Write a protein that binds this ligand. Structure first.
Ligand SMILES: N[C@@H](Cn1cc(I)c(=O)[nH]c1=O)C(=O)O
Ligand SMILES: N[C@@H](Cn1cc(I)c(=O)[nH]c1=O)C(=O)O
Lengths: 260, 259
């Protein structure tokens, strides 16, 4: 009755299925930055845990009508999971219904373009349409544009939700794929961490251009008020100060980089 | 009840304006954190008074007396209600005061005079012809003093005993030393400040290599204070709305002096 249920999401290189996952079981079926972070937190907080992939594969949004949550956030909110260890962005609306540790990773929305194509900035994109651009059809990135009060980003939002040929995508894979075949006619807006990862994987034909549009962080989430929150938060700060969080990113991002 | 805010004078976060002597109250000050204090106050619905921390320190616990000094101390021991300054969120501090999620992200970095043949902390650690140091107090210094990583440990062992003291008392001091050392001094400081100085005349400094760590500054309140929740949500809201980035651009770039 003491095992901690960890809700997470299959997103490379955070949580991935090991090659021989079929001959494995339990937490051993998975590997990745977050699988490793889960092990380190558990050790530091002294608890057993079971990794479980979020059922609807969503991060966490609330319906404006019903006010019901889905994704990992919903798992925590509705008593399904005891902790969320994944690339979950710390946001206002979420902070109101669940707890978040201080960030374990710092990032920001960035611009992905087809390598060999002209550099583009948010400003640049907002002033045209020949080059289509969009975001994941759900998540904090799409929300950023919907709730920002910055002229440039508001202009970009108006354009994106109005773009007849939908500029949104359902998965990171889709966005990346779209960038790779659009010959510069499609710029994908995604979190810098993922942009950096893809840039380190074959075919190596994409790249992060310009600075980030904002500064956010991923955090470990627990149900509102959970006593597990305090220890977890302190574990994150300790892990970061010991340099372990940095070694984890180098391991899963740059150590096996395949683009030079 | 007027909320007592403790902060510290450091450009461009908090600074007494030119003819501040002709003004009064909070109007005497200006800066990124002065603007941030007004934004937090408004969103939380409280009146406040800006005060400069008595001992000019950020916050550390004397290992011999166990007493906290600086802004952390003013919060822990009842002198201030909230701290709005470039205060780094750390483990030891987190244990005694509450921190909002970061309002700014940064990391330790290297400042050098353009032309200096250095490109990384690794390079620095491997020589001494080019001296290098940090502020004589604060988390930047602590990073090295408490580090257990070989490269950083070597840097620290060098720094603590460097005959001509490599430590500086203020940012202004470390910057002047870089500019006047003919390329023989590299100053280690928080990236955001490195980026600021880079926008100031005579535009002769630069940041090399990436940051040594990744952390953030947070608004701090006394442990258990009922002000914490509202403050945290205000910071997140201000960030999401883009105001935090507008302030950064305001004090760093719109006001920049290096084209
Ligand atoms: N972290 C987000 C999800 N998420 C992920 C990626 I990778 C991206 O590019 N954009 C997002 O909104 C959340 O928590 O909703
Ligand atoms: N943020 C630090 C203080 N601080 C400030 C600056 I500006 C810097 O360059 N280095 C520091 O350690 C703390 O909280 O101690």
């Amino acid at each position: 009755n003491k095992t901690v249920v960890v809700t997470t999401i299959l997103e490379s290189p955070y949580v991935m299925m090991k090659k021989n996952h079929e001959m494995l079981e339990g937490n051993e079926r998975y590997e990745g930055y977050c699988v490793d972070l889960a092990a380190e937190i558990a050790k530091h907080c002294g608890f057993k845990y079971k990794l479980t992939i979020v059922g609807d594969g969503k991060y966490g949004a609330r319906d404006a009508d019903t006010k019901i949550w889905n994704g990992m956030v919903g798992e925590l909110v509705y008593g399904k999971a005891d902790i969320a260890i994944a690339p979950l962005t710390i946001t206002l609306v979420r902070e109101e219904v669940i707890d978040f540790s201080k960030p374990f990773m710092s990032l920001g929305i960035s611009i992905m373009i087809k390598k060999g194509t002209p550099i583009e900035s948010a400003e640049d994109l907002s002033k045209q349409t020949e080059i289509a651009y969009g975001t994941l059809d759900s998540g904090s990135t799409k929300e950023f544009f919907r709730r920002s009060k910055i002229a440039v980003f508001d202009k970009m939002w108006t354009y994106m939700r109005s773009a007849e040929p939908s500029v949104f995508v359902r998965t990171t894979a889709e966005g990346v794929a779209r960038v790779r075949k659009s010959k510069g006619k499609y710029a994908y807006l995604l979190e810098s961490t993922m942009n950096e990862y893809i840039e380190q994987r074959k075919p190596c034909d994409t790249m992060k251009v310009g600075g980030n549009l904002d500064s956010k962080g991923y955090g470990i989430a627990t149900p509102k008020g959970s006593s597990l929150g305090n220890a977890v938060n302190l574990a994150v700060l300790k892990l970061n100060e010991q340099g372990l969080l940095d070694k984890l990113k180098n391991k899963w991002w740059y150590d096996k980089g395949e683009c030079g």
